[PDB]
Write an enzyme that holds these catalytic residues in place. Structure first.
Site, short mmCIF file in Angstrom:
data_model
loop_
_atom_site.label_atom_id
_atom_site.label_comp_id
_atom_site.label_asym_id
_atom_site.label_seq_id
_atom_site.Cartn_x
_atom_site.Cartn_y
_atom_site.Cartn_z
N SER A 42 -98.88 -52.16 21.18
CA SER A 42 -98.30 -53.42 21.63
C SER A 42 -97.03 -53.25 22.44
O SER A 42 -96.51 -54.25 22.90
CB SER A 42 -98.04 -54.37 20.51
OG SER A 42 -99.24 -54.82 19.96
N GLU A 140 -106.36 -56.56 24.28
CA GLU A 140 -106.22 -56.52 22.83
C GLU A 140 -107.55 -56.95 22.23
O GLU A 140 -108.16 -57.88 22.75
CB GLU A 140 -105.14 -57.49 22.39
CG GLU A 140 -103.75 -57.04 22.72
CD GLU A 140 -103.26 -56.04 21.69
OE1 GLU A 140 -104.09 -55.66 20.81
OE2 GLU A 140 -102.07 -55.65 21.75
#
EC number: 3.5.2.6
Length: 265
Positions: A42, A140
């Site tokens: 992330s 993601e």
């Protein structure tokens, strides 16, 4: 000696550790495996928000983005409670940095746009900042799951630190957009046990975390000394030897950060 101490940390945690603190007017670089590849996880959401800020006027932060429950494909603490109302671009930036919201990130990637739902555009943004090595290939949550050795979705401690340096401390963004990025990172909710845990309480820390498969745990931060001197700190880790489900170790980052704070005090 510091390199040996970082190696000792690796031994103790059964991990691979990567560190980079850029040199400053008054300090040498700290570098450990700084040119080896590590998955972003992330941590890419910080430069992603920069990319969105960079290529739009600030009024774009008020653009409402709508989406459905079927767009929730990754851990999304904020977006999954706003399916009925949607979220503005600014709300998505906030979520992506402060809660590592994966849906927010995917929506921002789509806002950058183009083939691959924004991953190419994101990679091109890093190219525009002088980063020739980093690459984002998946959105993601797939970008967290590449096997060791796969170059997809990787950066290096050196490359990402130099990106963050330009974004937060340099002139990659105009000062008003720069401020917004900095404020979101300053109010991150996910990073209290990583670089923050390694620096004394009278240092200011702003950060973006990443966590993934193969025991991946990263943190990229800017820290300010009690006398207001800033430094960029990138710490990346993995425990690939333990398999895809190896436990990520936040404490490893905290201790790496303590070593760095020992040098920078």
């Amino acid at each position: 000696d510091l390199a040996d101490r970082f190696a000792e940390l690796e031994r103790r945690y059964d991990a691979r550790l990567g560190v980079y603190v850029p040199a400053t007017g008054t300090t040498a670089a700290i570098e450990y495996r700084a040119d080896e590849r590590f998955a972003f996880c992330s941590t890419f959401k910080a430069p992603l928000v920069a990319a969105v800020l960079h290529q739009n006027p600030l009024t774009h932060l008020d653009k409402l983005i709508t989406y459905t429950s079927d767009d929730i494909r990754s851990i999304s603490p904020v977006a999954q409670q706003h399916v009925q109302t949607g979220m503005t671009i600014g709300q998505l930036c906030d979520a992506a940095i402060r809660y590592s919201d994966g849906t927010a990130a995917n929506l921002l990637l789509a806002d950058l746009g183009g083939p691959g739902g924004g991953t190419a555009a994101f990679t091109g943004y890093l190219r525009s900042l002088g980063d020739t090595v980093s690459r984002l290939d998946a959105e993601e949550p797939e970008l967290n799951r590449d096997p060791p050795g796969d170059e997809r979705d990787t950066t290096t401690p050196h490359a990402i630190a130099l990106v963050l340096q330009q974004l937060v401390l340099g002139n990659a963004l105009p000062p008003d957009k720069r401020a917004l990025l900095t404020d979101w990172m300053a109010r991150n909710t996910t990073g209290a046990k990583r670089i923050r845990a390694g620096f004394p309480a009278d240092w200011k820390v702003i950060d973006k975390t990443g966590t993934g498969d193969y025991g991946r745990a990263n943190d990229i931060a800017v820290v300010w000394s009690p006398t207001g001197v800033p430094y960029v700190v990138a710490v990346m880790s993995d425990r690939a030897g333990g398999g895809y489900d190896a436990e990520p170790r936040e404490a490893l980052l905290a201790e790496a950060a303590t070593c760095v704070a020992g040098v920078l005090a």
